[PDB]
Amino acid sequence: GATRIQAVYRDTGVEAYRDNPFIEALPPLQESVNSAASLKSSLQLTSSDLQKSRVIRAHTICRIPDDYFQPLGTHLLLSERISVMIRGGYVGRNPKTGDLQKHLQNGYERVQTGELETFRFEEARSTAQSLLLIGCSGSGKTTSLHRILATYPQVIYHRELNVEQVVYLKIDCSHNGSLKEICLNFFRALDRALGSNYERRYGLKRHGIETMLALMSQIANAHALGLLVIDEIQHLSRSRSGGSQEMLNFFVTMVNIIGVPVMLIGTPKAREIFEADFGAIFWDPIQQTQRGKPNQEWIAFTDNLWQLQLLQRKDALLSDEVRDVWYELSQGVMDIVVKLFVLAQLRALALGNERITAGLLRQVYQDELKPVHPMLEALRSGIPERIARYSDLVV
């Protein structure tokens, strides 16, 4: 599944991180000056590509959405929070000084008596913390998380011990708010990231749901799972009779009793689940003006995007009118901003006019982006009653 990395131990300068192998085998923390440049990506554009055939220049344009990433202000904060809550969940699970072994003995009682509040030892404490991410659709929650978690080795192997530390894992909810198909998703991800077979071992012998919930929290401690991410938590609203509260409590017990940190990602529609009953981060689309002066983020984004053109008769520089129409049509949602550019270039190639103007942008938006019109119209209106249905803005 994933390549194992033999661990080399470093020397952390923090007193609390004294002799914990699980947080000396991790890559070092980085400063914010280089954390905003370790995530940047772009496409090559060799200068000889402007003279190639139209079919090649058309198949090269299509890879812009998949290879262009620009770090923003909030990505640094999210990265720092993730790093702290990954390295802070191991201080209570030291494997050397008899502290992880006190957690694995308690877990056998839980799987044996079928209850998650059964304890044998009382000095086995856990520190996990938690997070919750909320933003509109297309804002970039998952593509800016796969990029952040891409600096960690996932599976690591220690020779002094015989443990395979799994640094992070990622799953998502079922299409209904089912209970038996989240445990199986966890097992499938776990044995697809290692190569083992836990879906045949657990979960195919006709266990009750409580037994499965007890077995899920023990194999997550056999391999020291540093972080768990559940994507699309808004699927929980369609749960069974009273089942929405059960897993909402279960994701609280693991953070509090077992010790595994948990992160949740969702849309504004998923705020209602938590409102009825975790830290909160709210993400919103780019605003053109917030200080009374043009936003530097928008200028930087458009200026860096504009330099990725394969058109022969390309414009010298981006004029104000093109920027204004680009913001008018897209309103700041990340996916539309790049897709509109890609489609405009793809039409300019075939139509014969190898340039970009405001009229071409409007025509492409009118022709090829029909299903997305009402949501962007509601965003442009700026009326709370219209946004009360869809458009995914938190009131």
Partner: protein
């Protein structure tokens, strides 16, 4: 299996396999047997296990633990290794690497006493405090499960509780401290505690790996020792002075407890068979008693070296 625990210091492999199913939440013994071994015909044995090699395969990446280290460091093999001889030691070592369980016991004929006895799960309540304050875990220790001494070489008696190894054949059991605490003082004998302390350093001695005498070396050693000691008849025993020394060193109650009560009247005695020409291997108790009664100032390893070199 992905995460097989490394053995703790001075632990039997039975406890390691038992913990390898507590660390992962396997409750039914058949599932644990099917995962670790792949067969449901294996028999749990405390001391002198078989089917080794599959245990060394799980600990392959940690380069240190091989079959030799598991055999000579985490079992009871060194108690039987030197006294049997050079002829059967290699065969037993070869046999323990494969799927022959009872054949190993047959080859180690001193352990081939047909039905055994005292299969109850022993423990020492004083050592468990150190185990919990040093490791956070409690496990079976090779000091406790001596073949015939229910005594700890550093604290005294052992607290039994009535669960038998052969009660459930396919189940690996791990000690739990909440169940464990049933300490009550018992009668204690200082002579047997001293014997246990004398016999303990044999387990952690590297000399027993490559040094083992033969039967004629044993009888030559005994006859030279008797002749130099001076309490002998004409090429025979006095039968009284040696027995008197044995009774002076050890009380009759101790030998009655050890199931080696002296029998002066009958012609067939274990001491007499020791003196006469050797025909079969003897247990460690008889050799230890003879050495202690006849050599009161020499250690076990040096005594064995003296017996084997000449």
């Amino acid at each position: 299996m992905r995460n097989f625990p490394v053995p703790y210091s001075n632990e039997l492999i039975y406890s390691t396999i038992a913990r390898a199913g507590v660390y992962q939440g396997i409750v039914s013994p058949k599932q644990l047997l099917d995962e670790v071994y792949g067969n449901r015909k294996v028999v749990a044995t405390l001391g002198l296990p078989s089917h080794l090699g599959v245990i060394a395969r799980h600990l392959h990446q940690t380069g240190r633990y091989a079959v030799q280290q598991l055999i000579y460091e985490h079992t009871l093999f060194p108690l039987y290794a030197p006294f049997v001889g050079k002829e059967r030691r290699d065969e037993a070592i070869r046999l323990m690497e494969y799927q022959a369980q009872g054949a190993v016991h047959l080859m180690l004929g001193v352990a081939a006493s047909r039905v055994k006895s005292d299969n109850r799960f022993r423990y020492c309540p004083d050592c468990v405090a150190l185990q919990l304050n040093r490791y956070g875990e409690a496990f079976w220790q090779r000091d406790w499960y001596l073949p015939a001494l229910p005594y700890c070489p550093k604290h005294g008696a052992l607290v039994f509780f009535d669960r038998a190894v052969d009660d459930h054949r396919h189940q690996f059991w791990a000690l739990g401290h909440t169940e464990l605490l049933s300490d009550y003082p018992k009668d204690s004998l200082s002579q047997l505690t001293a014997l246990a302390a004398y016999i303990a350093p044999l387990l952690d001695a590297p000399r027993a790996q490559e040094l083992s005498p033969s039967l004629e070396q044993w009888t030559l050693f005994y006859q030279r020792l008797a002749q130099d000691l001076g309490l002998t008849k004409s090429k025979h025993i006095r039968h009284d002075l040696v027995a008197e020394r044995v009774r002076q060193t050890f009380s009759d109650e101790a030998l009655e407890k050890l199931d080696l009560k002296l029998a002066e009247n009958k012609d067939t005695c274990w001491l007499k068979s020791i003196f006469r020409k050797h025909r079969k291997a003897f247990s460690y108790l008889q050799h230890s008693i003879v050495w202690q009664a006849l050599l009161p100032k020499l250690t076990v390893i040096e005594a064995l070296q003296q017996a084997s070199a000449l």
